[PDB]
Amino acid sequence: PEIRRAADNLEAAIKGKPLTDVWFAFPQLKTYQSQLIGQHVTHVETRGKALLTHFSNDLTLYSHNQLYGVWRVVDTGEETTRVLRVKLQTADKTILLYSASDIEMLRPEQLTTHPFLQRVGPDVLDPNLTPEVVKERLLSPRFRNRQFAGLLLDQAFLAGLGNYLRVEILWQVGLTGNHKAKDLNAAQLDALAHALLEIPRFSYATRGQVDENKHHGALFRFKVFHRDGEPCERCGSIIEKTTLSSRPFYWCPGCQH
């Protein structure tokens, strides 16, 4: 929805600024404190209800607030009943993590193997998530060999993808749901990599209030979702749709193959 706001608060506070002080409550983590001084937060990726705070040295602080965790932005100096776990501090700002337990420092190699992380992929409406990153994911050994039909329906791959976006996405790059990221030339792979973000962001950026369609058509129009029996704006073929089915698939047997 828009729960991806806590991450913006942290980025908006310490992103890019060199860390002047880093402190961790967990002893296992104390070893990363001095290593970060001088470094900065490149960005904060969201993953389900977790936060991945990336640093300029390739390290990544994983943290799941669960039931009580709560970040707080203060001023370098401003110092309450809750127990502090993490303290990242810049010249002007300092963000603080209180009450959390699910806290880990991960190396790039440990990202794809982390239990929770391999259950929820980046969110398509996440500004920091770039096409170049989606392509990598598409080509990783974990997905490169999956049919898009289900892959685009699997939240472990990418968060924010519903069946109504799956069909539209596939129709824009002319593909049927039986393709794999491994049966695609460089261009085809990149076309879809941009599709997965553009139509989802396009769809949302322009959503209109309810019942508004009664007097005004949205700027974003579906091309195959709920358009079975109508012609395809592209080639004119009658758009079909599967039954037999998880989520009703939609496509143009004419220009999708």
Ligand SMILES: [Ca+2]
């Ligand atoms: Ca489309």
Ligand SMILES: [Ca+2]
């Ligand atoms: Ca109006």
Ligand SMILES: [Ca+2]
């Ligand atoms: Ca083909």
Ligand SMILES: [Zn+2]
């Ligand atoms: Zn067509």
